[PDB]
Nucleic acid binder design. Structure first.
Ligand SMILES: [Mg+2]
Ligand SMILES: [Mg+2]
Ligand SMILES: [Mg+2]
Ligand SMILES: [Mg+2]
Ligand SMILES: [Mg+2]
Ligand SMILES: [Mg+2]
Ligand SMILES: [Mg+2]
Ligand SMILES: [Mg+2]
Ligand SMILES: [Mg+2]
Ligand SMILES: [Mg+2]
Ligand SMILES: [Mg+2]
Ligand SMILES: [Mg+2]
Ligand SMILES: [Mg+2]
Ligand SMILES: [Mg+2]
Ligand SMILES: [Mg+2]
Ligand SMILES: [Mg+2]
Ligand SMILES: [Mg+2]
Ligand SMILES: [Mg+2]
Ligand SMILES: [Mg+2]
Ligand SMILES: [Mg+2]
Ligand SMILES: [Mg+2]
Ligand SMILES: [Mg+2]
Ligand SMILES: [Mg+2]
Ligand SMILES: [Mg+2]
Ligand SMILES: [Mg+2]
Ligand SMILES: [Mg+2]
Ligand SMILES: [Mg+2]
Ligand SMILES: [Mg+2]
Ligand SMILES: [Mg+2]
Ligand SMILES: [Mg+2]
Ligand SMILES: [Mg+2]
Ligand SMILES: [Mg+2]
Ligand SMILES: [Mg+2]
Ligand SMILES: [Mg+2]
Ligand SMILES: [Mg+2]
Ligand SMILES: [Mg+2]
Ligand SMILES: [Mg+2]
Ligand SMILES: [Mg+2]
Ligand SMILES: [Mg+2]
Ligand SMILES: [Mg+2]
Ligand SMILES: [Mg+2]
Ligand SMILES: [Mg+2]
Ligand SMILES: [Mg+2]
Ligand SMILES: [Mg+2]
Ligand SMILES: [Mg+2]
Ligand SMILES: [Mg+2]
Ligand SMILES: [Mg+2]
Ligand SMILES: [Mg+2]
Ligand SMILES: [Mg+2]
Ligand SMILES: [Mg+2]
Ligand SMILES: [Mg+2]
Ligand SMILES: [Mg+2]
Ligand SMILES: [Mg+2]
Ligand SMILES: [Mg+2]
Ligand SMILES: [Mg+2]
Ligand SMILES: [Mg+2]
Ligand SMILES: [Mg+2]
Ligand SMILES: [Mg+2]
Ligand SMILES: [Mg+2]
Ligand SMILES: [Mg+2]
Ligand SMILES: [Mg+2]
Ligand SMILES: [Mg+2]
Ligand SMILES: [Mg+2]
Ligand SMILES: [Mg+2]
Ligand SMILES: [Mg+2]
Ligand SMILES: [Mg+2]
Ligand SMILES: [Mg+2]
Ligand SMILES: [Mg+2]
Ligand SMILES: [Mg+2]
Ligand SMILES: [Mg+2]
Lengths: 351, 141
RNA sequence: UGAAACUCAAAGGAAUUGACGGGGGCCCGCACAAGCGGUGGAGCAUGUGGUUUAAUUCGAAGCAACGCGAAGAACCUUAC
RNA sequence: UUCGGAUUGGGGUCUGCAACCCGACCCCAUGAAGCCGGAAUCGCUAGUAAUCGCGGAUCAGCCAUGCCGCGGUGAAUACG
RNA sequence: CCGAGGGUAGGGCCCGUGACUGGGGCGAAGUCGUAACAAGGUAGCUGUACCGGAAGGUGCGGCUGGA
RNA sequence: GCCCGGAUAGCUCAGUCGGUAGAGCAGGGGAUUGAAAAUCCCCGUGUCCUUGGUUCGAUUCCGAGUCCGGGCACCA
RNA sequence: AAUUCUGA
RNA sequence: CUCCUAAAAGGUAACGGAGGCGCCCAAAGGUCCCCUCAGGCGGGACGGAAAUCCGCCGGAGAGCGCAAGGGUAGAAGGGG
RNA sequence: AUCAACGGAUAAAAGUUACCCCGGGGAUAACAGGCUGAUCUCCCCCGAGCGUCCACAGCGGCGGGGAGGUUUGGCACCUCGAUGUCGGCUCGUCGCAUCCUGGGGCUGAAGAAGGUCCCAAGGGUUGGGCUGUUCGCCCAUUAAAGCGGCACGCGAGCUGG
């Protein structure tokens, strides 16, 4: 975490790529099309900031006993001159490390976890309820406004569904790696002979985004024809352009209407339908987008877990990274800040 | 936008426009102002669409004084409906404006930005306007 | 009259020993019934779930865990 | 209510280095809820139940109304 | 004359394919109820008939692998 | 567009001459259960859609508005 | 005339 | 029936703007005699921000059974 | 007496007609014209802001001014002693607000291609599938497969879906 942060950042890698930036940089090769220039210095600052990183490390490493003299001498100034450059250091130590992780699209949004009990029927419905209390307490004590969306207390035990809001900053970026399958091994409190069975669950997580609903269509967005309606009407139907036709060029969807004898009221009913059928293509694409934001995994059956929890052998093995703690009880109650970082490191690794 | 929040009667007669303002011929607020040359009913939509045209031009600057207020209910019969059968329904609101009326006036800005933030608003009005700066009539002795 | 693909490591007969029966016969126990005094209500003591907390140390969980380890927690104890 | 003694203010003794969290008592002043307890539900067949008081272990003190003992008074009912 | 073969017309068999649809096997977790195994909580099963979200129910006669 | 009828607890719905406010369901606390259901006690929350007015007071009686339910839009 | 009890 | 439209007499149309009436009082009627409001500011146990009191200031903004208008306390209003 | 249709026809009364009829009306609707131009089509003013940069290569928020007389309307002026109504076919002709082809300025025009505005109708502007269709969509092309006015041209020229 603190002592380890360095390595997994391109600690030795970056400091070699860094000069590759400035590499092609100099020698203005007919600087025509603007491209690297942008991500030229910004990618550079990253570099020599691994020194500010080894300075806040050294200033924080030369700080291990950087108070051995303050354990022998309390009053002075030659000992309060580097300190105003040491308090700020223990700050960036965290900064240049968690500002390298959360470094992705939209995380600072309020999150929305969802818990659905996988296999194991009733066990899973309960193990689900426990997984609920977990993030809750966590996010709760973590300084996050927690709003309960849903809670469907299933059949015999536990729940069937749960969805809650995570009001705060980077709430999503935090409770994001959690998204996935969570297994639970322990003798079934439900089973008869307190036998040993395995439980599964699903925990989805997504950023809060859409709040409004706007669907207005510019005139040029469409096209309106008018022709003589087909049907009864004697001279009328014959010599009037009562029949309308709205066509939305982009989608190609078109609507026709000869309902009433008024070209006018028919345009009205027309668009009225057109809109309706436009929101349907608007919501059809409004969800094929946000649903591809759930993932591409989680069959919620066996062998899909990404971190199991055991209680009759006290431990918690995170399959994703390999990490394995020995305090299931602590994890299931808040303790997460450990596996959350790591969870990211693993992930953000490929981007 | 910009309409009353009351009035005793929802719809009122069309009235008539016999020239020369009833008042508001002198500029009694800001430095430079805008005065109407030809009679007309200015719409709520127009007043606003010029008030912004104004600010937007000189963003984060002086103060604008709107001295006309649309308190006349403007009506109109639906489309394709025939004559009679009661008075049309309200469309929006207008403000009566006769020749000489100082509609607008800006304050706390350079004449450079005055005789411009006005020239623009003028193009948003259905009538001819002219610009003026405080002069003859002042409230003193 | 009468198949197949596909799929399972069994399907199945009888007879054992038990367990079980809103099967039977026989028979016990404050099990009911007969009777007396309580609990649930109230204020307080204590144990526990829970929540809260920097921590509110751990265990016990139906009967057979909950005045149980505790036949003595101000610091000791004491594990937080 | 001369029932019932919660809560609270004020004054004190004692143990302990020290009792604000957190001690047990003492005295003055407060005097709360509670007019026999819904659905339910426990114990006991005789010196038993019910009822009264005492002792010990623990232990400086003590949150014991707990636990383990001792005796004093002394029932009801059991067809089946 | 016959004649390989080519064309024309209509048949028969088999293989492949088809929007949709029928029921089937399998599937360590759903929803509904609980039909059968103990007088299985209306003894069960059976050929057939009618009915019903579903097991199933009921009628008629048959068997006992039930009383 | 016209003309009827609506909106009341979380869902489905009663209710009054103008002062009041409800039922069945869901839901919370208890009880039997080994544990659920069922069953059994205890429970409560509503501007009675919005916005005006009349009244001393409006869920209630009138104006208007929004959403939903019906019925018509015919001769050419 | 009173159901249900998954999966090591 | 009341206002406006209606162009300072009266009158004046439109499927023009906006509302009321189809009753009511045995006192809400005659007359005689008294009385004067609504509000606002301070003061006052319960007391809203108007219950009933007290004191100043208040020319009619109150009241007049119900729509609107005119009228009106030098009473048409309040009481006997 | 809700004779409330409120100067009150009887004491006493609803529908339907595409099976219809007569008397009347262009005093009055449906077609066409007319007047109007809200709607429609085209044009322009302003310049927020877009266009990596830069208001105007290409665009134009809020607002504003017009033109045309193709559409849906408003009105009800000739015509009800009759002005035959859709589409197709045939025959065309006029407009320009140009779909090709001829000229030309800009360009975010390298070139070939395009885009936008200007000038310019001389002549051109295909064949089919579906539908009564106008309108549209599609197939196969093309230099292009223009938009309108002519009583939505044309039934004493035809068809009659
Ligand atoms: Mg589920
Ligand atoms: Mg759900
Ligand atoms: Mg017809
Ligand atoms: Mg027509
Ligand atoms: Mg305001
Ligand atoms: Mg004059
Ligand atoms: Mg055979
Ligand atoms: Mg056998
Ligand atoms: Mg027996
Ligand atoms: Mg005994
Ligand atoms: Mg009690
Ligand atoms: Mg342990
Ligand atoms: Mg514990
Ligand atoms: Mg103790
Ligand atoms: Mg310690
Ligand atoms: Mg103390
Ligand atoms: Mg009792
Ligand atoms: Mg007692
Ligand atoms: Mg031959
Ligand atoms: Mg076949
Ligand atoms: Mg069967
Ligand atoms: Mg059964
Ligand atoms: Mg049975
Ligand atoms: Mg049964
Ligand atoms: Mg049968
Ligand atoms: Mg039956
Ligand atoms: Mg039978
Ligand atoms: Mg409701
Ligand atoms: Mg009440
Ligand atoms: Mg009820
Ligand atoms: Mg309950
Ligand atoms: Mg319960
Ligand atoms: Mg209630
Ligand atoms: Mg039952
Ligand atoms: Mg079930
Ligand atoms: Mg089982
Ligand atoms: Mg007059
Ligand atoms: Mg006059
Ligand atoms: Mg007063
Ligand atoms: Mg008060
Ligand atoms: Mg009189
Ligand atoms: Mg009198
Ligand atoms: Mg009569
Ligand atoms: Mg009559
Ligand atoms: Mg009459
Ligand atoms: Mg009659
Ligand atoms: Mg017929
Ligand atoms: Mg005939
Ligand atoms: Mg006939
Ligand atoms: Mg006849
Ligand atoms: Mg005739
Ligand atoms: Mg005429
Ligand atoms: Mg005439
Ligand atoms: Mg006409
Ligand atoms: Mg004509
Ligand atoms: Mg515009
Ligand atoms: Mg024309
Ligand atoms: Mg016309
Ligand atoms: Mg006329
Ligand atoms: Mg005619
Ligand atoms: Mg003639
Ligand atoms: Mg003729
Ligand atoms: Mg030209
Ligand atoms: Mg070129
Ligand atoms: Mg053809
Ligand atoms: Mg055809
Ligand atoms: Mg032509
Ligand atoms: Mg024609
Ligand atoms: Mg025909
Ligand atoms: Mg024919």
């Amino acid at each position: 975490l603190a002592q380890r942060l360095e390595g997994l950042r391109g600690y030795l890698d970056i400091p070699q790529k860094e000069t590759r930036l400035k590499e092609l940089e100099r020698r203005l090769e007919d600087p025509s099309l603007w491209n690297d220039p942008e991500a030229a210095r910004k990618v550079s600052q990253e570099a020599a900031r691994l020194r500010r990183t080894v300075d806040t490390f050294r200033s924080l490493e030369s700080d291990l006993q950087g108070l051995l003299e303050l354990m022998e001498e309390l009053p002075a100034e030659e000992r309060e001159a580097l300190k105003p450059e040491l308090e700020e250091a223990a700050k960036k130590l965290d900064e240049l490390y968690h500002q390298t992780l959360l470094n992705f699209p939209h995380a600072e949004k309020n999150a929305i976890l969802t818990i659905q009990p996988g296999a194991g029927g009733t066990e899973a419905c309960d193990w689900a309820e426990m997984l609920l209390r977990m993030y809750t307490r966590f996010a709760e004590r973590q300084g996050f406004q927690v709003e309960v969306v849903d809670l469907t207390p299933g059949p015999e035990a536990g729940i069937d569904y749960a969805q809650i809001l995570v009001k705060g900053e980077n709430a999503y970026g935090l409770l994001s790696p959690e998204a996935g399958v969570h297994r639970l091994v322990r003798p079934s409190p439900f089973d008869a002979s307190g036998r040993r069975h395995t439980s599964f669950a699903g925990v989805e997580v997504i950023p809060e985004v859409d709040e409004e609903v706007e669907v207005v269509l510019k005139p040029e967005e469409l096209r309106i024809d008018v022709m003589r309606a087909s049907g009864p009407g004697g001279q009328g139907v014959n010599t009037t352009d009562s029949a309308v036709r709205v066509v939305h060029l982009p989608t190609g969807i078109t609507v026709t209407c000869q309902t009433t004898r008024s070209q006018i009221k028919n345009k009205e009913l027309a668009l009225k339908i057109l809109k309706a059928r436009l929101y349907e293509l608007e919501r059809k694409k409004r969800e094929e987008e946000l649903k591809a934001l759930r993932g591409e995994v989680e069959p919620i059956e066996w062998g899909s877990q990404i971190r199991s929890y055991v209680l009759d052998k006290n431990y918690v093995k995170d399959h994703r990274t390999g990490l394995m703690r020995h305090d299931p009880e602590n994890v299931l109650d808040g303790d997460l800040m450990d596996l959350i970082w790591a969870g990211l490191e693993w992930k953000a690794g490929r981007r | 936008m910009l309409m009353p929040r009351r009035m005793k009667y929802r719809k009122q007669q069309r009235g008539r426009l016999k020239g020369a303002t009833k008042g508001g011929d002198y500029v009694a607020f800001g430095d430079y102002g805008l005065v109407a040359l030809e009679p007309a009913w200015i719409t709520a939509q127009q007043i606003e669409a010029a008030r912004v045209a104004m600010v937007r031009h000189f963003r984060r600057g002086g103060k604008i004084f709107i001295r006309i207020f649309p308190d006349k209910p403007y009506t109109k019969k639906p489309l394709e409906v025939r004559m009679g059968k009661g008075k049309g329904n309200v469309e929006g609101y207008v403000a009566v404006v006769k020749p000489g009326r100082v509609m607008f006036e800006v304050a706390g800005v350079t004449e450079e930005q005055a005789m411009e933030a006005l020239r623009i608003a003028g193009h948003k009005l259905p009538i001819k306007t002219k610009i003026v700066r405080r002069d003859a009539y002042d409230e003193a002795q």
